[PDB]
Amino acid sequence: YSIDTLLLHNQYKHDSQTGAVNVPIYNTSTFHQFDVDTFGKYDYSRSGNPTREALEDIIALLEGGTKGFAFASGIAAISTAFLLLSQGDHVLISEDVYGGTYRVITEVLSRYGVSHTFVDMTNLEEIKQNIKPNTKLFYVETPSNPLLKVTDIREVSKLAKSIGALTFVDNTFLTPLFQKPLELGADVVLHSATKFIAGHSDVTAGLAVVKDSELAQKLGFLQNAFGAILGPQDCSLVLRGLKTLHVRLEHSAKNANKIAHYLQEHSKVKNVYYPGLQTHLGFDIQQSQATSAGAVLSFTLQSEDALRKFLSKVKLPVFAVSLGAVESILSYPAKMSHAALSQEARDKRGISNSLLRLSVGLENVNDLISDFENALSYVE
Amino acid sequence: YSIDTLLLHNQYKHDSQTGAVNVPIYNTSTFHQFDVDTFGKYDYSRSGNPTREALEDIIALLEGGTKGFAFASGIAAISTAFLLLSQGDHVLISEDVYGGTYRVITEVLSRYGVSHTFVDMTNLEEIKQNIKPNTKLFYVETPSNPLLKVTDIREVSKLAKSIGALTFVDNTFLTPLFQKPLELGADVVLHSATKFIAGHSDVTAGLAVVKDSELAQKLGFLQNAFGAILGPQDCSLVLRGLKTLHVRLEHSAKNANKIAHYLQEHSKVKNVYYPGLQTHLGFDIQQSQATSAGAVLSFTLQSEDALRKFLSKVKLPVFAVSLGAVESILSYPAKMSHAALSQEARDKRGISNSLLRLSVGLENVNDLISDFENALSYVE
Amino acid sequence: YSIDTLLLHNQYKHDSQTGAVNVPIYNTSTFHQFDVDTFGKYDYSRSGNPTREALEDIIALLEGGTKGFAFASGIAAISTAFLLLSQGDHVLISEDVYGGTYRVITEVLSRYGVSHTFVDMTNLEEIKQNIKPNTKLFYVETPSNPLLKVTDIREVSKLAKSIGALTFVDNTFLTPLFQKPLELGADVVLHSATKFIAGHSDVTAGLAVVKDSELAQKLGFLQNAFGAILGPQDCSLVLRGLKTLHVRLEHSAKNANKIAHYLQEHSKVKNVYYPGLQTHLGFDIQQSQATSAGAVLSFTLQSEDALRKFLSKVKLPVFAVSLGAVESILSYPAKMSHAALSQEARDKRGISNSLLRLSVGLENVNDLISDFENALSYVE
Amino acid sequence: YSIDTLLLHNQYKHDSQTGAVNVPIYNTSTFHQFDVDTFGKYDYSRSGNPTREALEDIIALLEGGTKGFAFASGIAAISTAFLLLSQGDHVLISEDVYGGTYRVITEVLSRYGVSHTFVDMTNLEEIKQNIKPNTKLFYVETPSNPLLKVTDIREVSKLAKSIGALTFVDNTFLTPLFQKPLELGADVVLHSATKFIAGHSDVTAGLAVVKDSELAQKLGFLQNAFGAILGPQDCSLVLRGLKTLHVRLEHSAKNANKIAHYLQEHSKVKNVYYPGLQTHLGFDIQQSQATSAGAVLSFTLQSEDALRKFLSKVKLPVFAVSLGAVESILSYPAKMSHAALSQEARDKRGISNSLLRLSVGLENVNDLISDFENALSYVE
Structure with missing residues (x-):
């Protein structure tokens, strides 16, 4: 099946228990435990719930990844993914990044000993030049706003791989329909679902997908620990938007x-x-x-x-x-x-x-x- | 008017334009700008919107503060408030803190050079003993879970004030109805609105209030920059819960x-x-x-x-x-x-x-x- | 258990499949049929769905009835219950009824050969006087708006029973907490849930309860056939309101x-x-x-x-x-x-x-x- | 502008007061009156509110009508429009009508002296044959379910006009995008918005549009009087669906x-x-x-x-x-x-x-x- 069929034909097309063609909104923070020792699939909505779980699986499916993560906003997804770094770590990042990404690297993570250099990610040489021994991340946003400059995801990823550095790609502009950064060597793909994914200007949302089970454990841990989760009613609007x-x-x-x-x-x-x-x-x-x-x-x-x-x-x-x-x-x-x-x-x-x-x-x-x-x- | 009257008699009791006794849900991410140069009250939902703004003002009113801040979860409010610290800063914190607060101090902020000591905040001497030259924050949660131990907010605050250190109080358990940490010398008060404030187990939400306009600018900046915002439909459920x-x-x-x-x-x-x-x-x-x-x-x-x-x-x-x-x-x-x-x-x-x-x-x-x-x- | 306990301790306190302490919002019109011949619990949301079903059972429980019915508005519940009559049928009704009830009897059901006389239902004699051979319904609203006049439900019901006429009681003002018309001889109890039941001025809703399985089949048939149903998201707000x-x-x-x-x-x-x-x-x-x-x-x-x-x-x-x-x-x-x-x-x-x-x-x-x-x- | 542009470019593209590109959800039943004598645009949500008003105007625009009416379900829209008839009135109706329409004519309006004959509306002669002196309505559904038989709307309307009888057309199958019954001589156009208009199987809704201000007053009166209104949160889902x-x-x-x-x-x-x-x-x-x-x-x-x-x-x-x-x-x-x-x-x-x-x-x-x-x- 092509991706346009997968938007509709997936695990959530019909609820097992009821036949529901839409995922019910679990507006619940608390889940009753029927046993003292074992807990049941859900203990607490922030930790996980069926509405968020469906959106997380469907975006993982669209991007060709193993796990998806839904956040209160695209910038919360980007910020949470940066918590994968520690003090001392250095970041090569696009000089044209989204203003919110710019502000978090320069005003927040700079106070925690995460350093950066802004570069033309379209110039493989200028990238190569500013590599440092502590460079752990390459941050790509393609195409760029507002001149739609293009970054070669495969080549930037290869360079990153060559120094065991991570690649993050902000794929907001093209969506998984048109561009699949995980197949091109990215480690994390990031979305403002606020934009084309949800598509109706009516919900603020962020997504991240990964293909590696270790990164998935770390990002899942940070999603829960910082708690910048997408609420179930907002997940429902994103799920509805994805269908078109x-x-x-x-x-x-x-x-x-x-x-x-x-x-x-x-x-x-x-x-x-x-x-x-x-x-x-x-x-x-x-x-x-x-x-x-x-x-x-x-x-x-x-x-x-x-x-x-x-x-x-x-x-x-x-x-x-x-x-x-x-x-x-x-x-x-x-x-x-x-x-x-x-x-x-x-x-x-x-x-x-x-x-x-x-x-x-x-x-x-x-x-x-x-x-x-x-x-x-x-x-x- | 007593606080039980203020839950109902406030700025949002009737919408100016329409008489609406409930704040409309602004399920909008985008606001049209009617002018090229000046922007209008709202540019973007993450930055601000009328539903979130009402919840923020009402919690500031209940806690006797100047500004309120609504977050995707109580732990997102707590995590955002910790971003007020930089690498090098030291934290004195309750050994009985909420497990989510424990995990963020020990597993996340420890990677960014924010150090801590866990103490009995009910023992003013043990607190005094573990002060360091770089101690910037005292973190109080009273009463404690699950033995309901009590911290003397006034005395802990005075000690903090005496070394220009901040005081944060997690006031989830008693709510603003029963305890007002800002009047007792706290600088930031934090809530899981998920609990008693919303009160119906149906929404995940966090709140912070401050009384100081500089701290308000810094926390507002971090709310927007990390983006762990409460969505408008979730704000509406919290606003409804507050009424009872x-x-x-x-x-x-x-x-x-x-x-x-x-x-x-x-x-x-x-x-x-x-x-x-x-x-x-x-x-x-x-x-x-x-x-x-x-x-x-x-x-x-x-x-x-x-x-x-x-x-x-x-x-x-x-x-x-x-x-x-x-x-x-x-x-x-x-x-x-x-x-x-x-x-x-x-x-x-x-x-x-x-x-x-x-x-x-x-x-x-x-x-x-x-x-x-x-x-x-x-x-x- | 007293009724104040039953508001919380009932069949819907914890979802079987997940432990959810709130009934999920089934925002679904269509249910997939897993079999060609047998249909599954739900075929179509108007016909029934889990969110509406919980509100219907809980109001039946509070009023001491066998079946409950949720409608788009209190006046839709009242109007649907009047479709129990046919042309030729006569109605004795309170001269002080809600203006919406007044308008439906005088401007709509009058065009369909349903006749009426308005009376002081507080005067058992004036009631007795205006009985006709085709009188099928006594319509009680106690206490009355806006002078809070009281109708003797037991005595009006006995008189109705004595000519095989139905009794309807609009119990909006006191709710099931304070008054149980089905225990006092009423056949149908009617609510504007818009008022005290939901209690937060944020949803328009009607309820009806009956104790007789034939009337239940007829009213259920009319609920589906006219289709003035309460949507699932509105049922959820009423369910939340009922808890306080x-x-x-x-x-x-x-x-x-x-x-x-x-x-x-x-x-x-x-x-x-x-x-x-x-x-x-x-x-x-x-x-x-x-x-x-x-x-x-x-x-x-x-x-x-x-x-x-x-x-x-x-x-x-x-x-x-x-x-x-x-x-x-x-x-x-x-x-x-x-x-x-x-x-x-x-x-x-x-x-x-x-x-x-x-x-x-x-x-x-x-x-x-x-x-x-x-x-x-x-x-x- | 073509109709595909009008789905987006209309009166509700940007909120005056705020720039909101989506109509706020007015989850309010009560509106405060700022004056004792004059009432303000809204008194009561059932009577009217800004979210429902936008959906009503937009469907009137798409169908080329003067007024639109939003109902709890398509069958509630159909049932309300039939209340335009009185006892004695006769209905010529398609033998292939939707089962819900069939049931309301045969089981409900038959008890109120509204009679009918089911006919092949594709046979202008069989229609002509079964006309009666009291025939007030022709009820068309084109194309028919499930053989997609076609009724000549213009010819059926002309025949209806020739005996001062009304024409209703159920235009659910084609929507206003493909077929405009009011331009073809229909007096009322009816939709199950549950189907293609909303398009996402997630909301139950009905619409009616008229072009005549007298019929508009009568249908508006019946919408309010029976009260089978679409709730604001459901209007919002229909408004969102219409955009695609x-x-x-x-x-x-x-x-x-x-x-x-x-x-x-x-x-x-x-x-x-x-x-x-x-x-x-x-x-x-x-x-x-x-x-x-x-x-x-x-x-x-x-x-x-x-x-x-x-x-x-x-x-x-x-x-x-x-x-x-x-x-x-x-x-x-x-x-x-x-x-x-x-x-x-x-x-x-x-x-x-x-x-x-x-x-x-x-x-x-x-x-x-x-x-x-x-x-x-x-x-x-």
């Missing part, structure tokens, strides 16, 4: 590709960043490790002036910090994700004041293209 | 006191541990810092044999790891909370194989006493 | 009694209507069929002017159409429940423009009495 | 068409019933009133023996009473929907013991076709 992940992402990715091609040929558009354009650096690497360019693109207008005119005229997209919704989302990274950086740090990452990110939702591609046409008509 | 906290705890505490007095006079009962018994060490300290002995007691039968006979015959209580439910809960700490300790560590904490904890629920006190009578009839 | 019904109502009823006695002695108060006042007509009948006067009272100020002054000054109560909340609710029946009547119909029911209803919540009785004192201070 | 209705139904309908063509050419299949087959009676009528054949087909094997062999071997579909799920559902109408009929009534409707219905979900069409191939391999 194939039809949502196939449609949004295909329409993102058409809109990228249309924007790349408009005379008022300076640059388009999308890994499905042949001229996009990483095009080759993307095709070798993923089965789609995804549903997110960025583009540059002529000036900050054009960009503000465009935003004032477009009707269809929501204007928000986030992505991966069934509604199209326009973001202004210079004013949102990257506002807190120096102008110099934004200039180095190519994050100009003319740049917009589009997360493509489920609107008719022809309505999205017309809405853009119309808004671009009032520019230049 | 006075009528639930007044009834359970009063019935716990009657059952403690009845058990202390039964010939088949060896010991009763309850801070409302005049003969309980800490009786005086409890009355000076709290307005009730609470809803939890422990007692010892003659042998492990009597205890197993009693458990086989009692009908009313649930048998579980937890407490603070509307259903009465019997626990066997030697087999549950403290199973993982050495026999020597259990012998030192007074945690014998004859000892049961009772969390008193809302059953008729006369039905509970009869059910105990009946079960004790088949013993000795 | 004893501690909520014991506190509110006791405080209602103190506030009734205090209002009856204030010089600016003209009348108090409460079945716990010795001078209240029905006092004797109430004590004979119920174990409390309940949590609702009404009172009259000197004028509409005093009433408006009082409302402008009181701080604690919410001002709303409803009752049975953990927050105290003041209502103005002349402007709310009974606005749509003629002045003549309000004059006959004693529903003056000086009259307020109070549903007593969980606020400190001394804060409620002070808040009333203070507001009455600005009157006369 | 285009990508779900476009995929399922396209795959249903491929599977219908594949089954029609298999040598072990006797008949295929699908309105997208050129040889299906109603093919022409379907294309004239709808933009797709939909996601449901039926087919006949050689014998009851083949059918039981096929069911024993197929792996992918769930086996259930229902349809319109993201999981493929096989049903056996002779044993499920139509078990309760005489063999003669099933013989007349063409509902043989060799017939299966398939509701196509979101599985890979090639996995569904292979799973059928494989199972058919063990037959004949």
Whole structure:
């Protein structure tokens, strides 16, 4: 069976006891013990419960892993996975990482003797150069926000393997549908399920999957010990969202590709960043490790002036910090994700004041293209 | 107004826009920005949202604090508050702390150069003795599980203040109704809302309150940065539970006191541990810092044999790891909370194989006493 | 075991398969059939499901009945129970019935040849007088809104029995805790669970219980056939609310009694209507069929002017159409429940423009009495 | 904008007060009134609330109507719409109607002097023949279950209009995406939102839309008066489901068409019933009133023996009473929907013991076709 069938045909398609086609919501913190000595499958909801257990198994299945872990947020999943390191440990990490990941490495784990260097993970040499004797982790996020730069997961993993260092990949942007980091040599794959997996902007959630039973024991231990667990009612919303992940992402990715091609040929558009354009650096690497360019693109207008005119005229997209919704989302990274950086740090990452990110939702591609046409008509 | 009125008469008694007497559930991760430059009250649910904000303000109000913080679990609240420390920092902590707190200090923060000594916080001298130049935190849990030993919050706080060290108090057992650690000199108060606050065994939740605006900025920063947030639907269940906290705890505490007095006079009962018994060490300290002995007691039968006979015959209580439910809960700490300790560590904490904890629920006190009578009839 | 123990100690205290102390939410419309010929306990959620089934059994237990039925609203329960009648059938009904019941008899069932006469059910003679050969139903609501008039359930039932006519009792105001109409000769007992049973103003729900297996088959058939079912997530909120019904109502009823006695002695108060006042007509009948006067009272100020002054000054109560909340609710029946009547119909029911209803919540009785004192201070 | 854009771009895409991209869940029964005289937008949740109001407006928008009405179940929507009739009124109704509709006309409304004749609504002459002077309603369900017979909505409506009789259409099978009965002359359109609209088998819900403001006042009055309302938390699940209705139904309908063509050419299949087959009676009528054949087909094997062999071997579909799920559902109408009929009534409707219905979900069409191939391999 292909992965689009597995979203529906798995262990949780029908409850044994009742035939229920949806996993019941166990809104219970306490489980009665029918025996004094042996405890029963569940003692305590934080430790485990049937709703969370189903989401954990299904994400492990989608990513080709042995165990899955559900967290209160994607950043809680990322933070918990970093607790796998101890003081003294060094981290090579993408200079383009999610702002939340940036903040946890620089402001929290720095107080606990976990050091880091930010690097271009797309440059295998610059990576090689900054290796240290205590380097225990390579942290990859591909494709990158908001220019969709591509990291060669296989090559970064091989380098990590060569010094017994771990590889973590934040696979939020493409989901398990399009990219499977564990098959490419990653040790931990991390998701903000808040984004495309849940897909409806209605729940905050994080997932991690591993393939190694020792790492699984350690991450499971940290999930329970820090306690940043996804509540059962939130697991249920993620489980429901997962059921449409194939039809949502196939449609949004295909329409993102058409809109990228249309924007790349408009005379008022300076640059388009999308890994499905042949001229996009990483095009080759993307095709070798993923089965789609995804549903997110960025583009540059002529000036900050054009960009503000465009935003004032477009009707269809929501204007928000986030992505991966069934509604199209326009973001202004210079004013949102990257506002807190120096102008110099934004200039180095190519994050100009003319740049917009589009997360493509489920609107008719022809309505999205017309809405853009119309808004671009009032520019230049 | 007394605190039992404030549970209902506060800022959230009626929604401004609609009159709603309950805070709407904002099941939203994304907020549309109506302006390019200024953002609106909410950008992103993890950062803040109206449902979580109401629970945070109401727990701050109940504890007499300036800011409240809602987490995915009590242990996530405790773990996040420990991230206030850095490597090098030393912690004086209760040897009787919750097993989850024990595990995070000994197995996680020990890998980050945060050291600790476990002490009897009821012995001001033993505390004084183990102070170090780098001691930054005193961690109090009063009353203690499962012997309900009492810590003098005011005296421990004064000692902490005298070396510019922080005081944290885990106030899960008594709730803000009965004990207000911030008024007694604590810097952070911590709750498993999973227990009495929510009160219905149906949601996992943690709370922290502070009175100092700097600590509030730091803890708020850590809440967002690690991301172990309480989801809005779970906040709603905690908000609903809080509305009965006075009528639930007044009834359970009063019935716990009657059952403690009845058990202390039964010939088949060896010991009763309850801070409302005049003969309980800490009786005086409890009355000076709290307005009730609470809803939890422990007692010892003659042998492990009597205890197993009693458990086989009692009908009313649930048998579980937890407490603070509307259903009465019997626990066997030697087999549950403290199973993982050495026999020597259990012998030192007074945690014998004859000892049961009772969390008193809302059953008729006369039905509970009869059910105990009946079960004790088949013993000795 | 007393009824306050049965709220917690029943078939649903611990899930067989898992120990769950709360009934899982079966958010499922479809159940997989593991066999072609036999169907399994559940085929379809509207027909039945485990969450609704638990609420149905627990309300049957509380009311001393054989079967319970959960509906989308109290008025849906009342409307479904009226479908037990056919065209030609005549109904004797309380002239003081809930406005929703009034509207369904007069505007809907009147188009289907179900006729009625409105009567004082407190006058056994006026009832006797308006009996007809086709009278199939006596509809009782005791105590009445908003003057809390009392109907003798036993005597009305005996009269009904004597002509093979049914008795329905709307027991919303007192709940099964205080009044058990099935033990007093009623055939159907009806609840707005929206009110005291759920108790938190957060869910709309109706219940019906019967003791006769034929009526149970007919009402079950109508529940399924019209389909006005309570959804599983709403059943869960009602199940959660039921767990505090004893501690909520014991506190509110006791405080209602103190506030009734205090209002009856204030010089600016003209009348108090409460079945716990010795001078209240029905006092004797109430004590004979119920174990409390309940949590609702009404009172009259000197004028509409005093009433408006009082409302402008009181701080604690919410001002709303409803009752049975953990927050105290003041209502103005002349402007709310009974606005749509003629002045003549309000004059006959004693529903003056000086009259307020109070549903007593969980606020400190001394804060409620002070808040009333203070507001009455600005009157006369 | 096309309808697939309107599923996302409507009045509820962003909350005014907060930017919320999802409508908050108003779990509130009571609304505080800030004024004594005027009431505020909401008085009581049964009467109206913001979550239900959004679902009601969005379904009105999709069906091209002026008002929408949300009910506890599709059968509650159908039953409420029948309360538009009075005793004496006569109904012409499809002999193939949903079993719940059949039961309410024959067992409930028959006791209230509402008479009916069951007819082939696909035969304009047989309809014409059974008209009576008191005929007030024509009840259409197209396409029919389980042979997908097609009713000419325009022609049935014209006939109804010609005697001032109402037209109701149950549009559950095609949804507003594919068929708009109000544009074809229907007065009321009815949905089981339980099926494709919600689409995830996780909520029971009904909808009705009208275009006429008088009918809207009458149906709104009956929605409130009988009280068979959809709770806010259930409205939220329907609102969430609606967001994927285009990508779900476009995929399922396209795959249903491929599977219908594949089954029609298999040598072990006797008949295929699908309105997208050129040889299906109603093919022409379907294309004239709808933009797709939909996601449901039926087919006949050689014998009851083949059918039981096929069911024993197929792996992918769930086996259930229902349809319109993201999981493929096989049903056996002779044993499920139509078990309760005489063999003669099933013989007349063409509902043989060799017939299966398939509701196509979101599985890979090639996995569904292979799973059928494989199972058919063990037959004949």
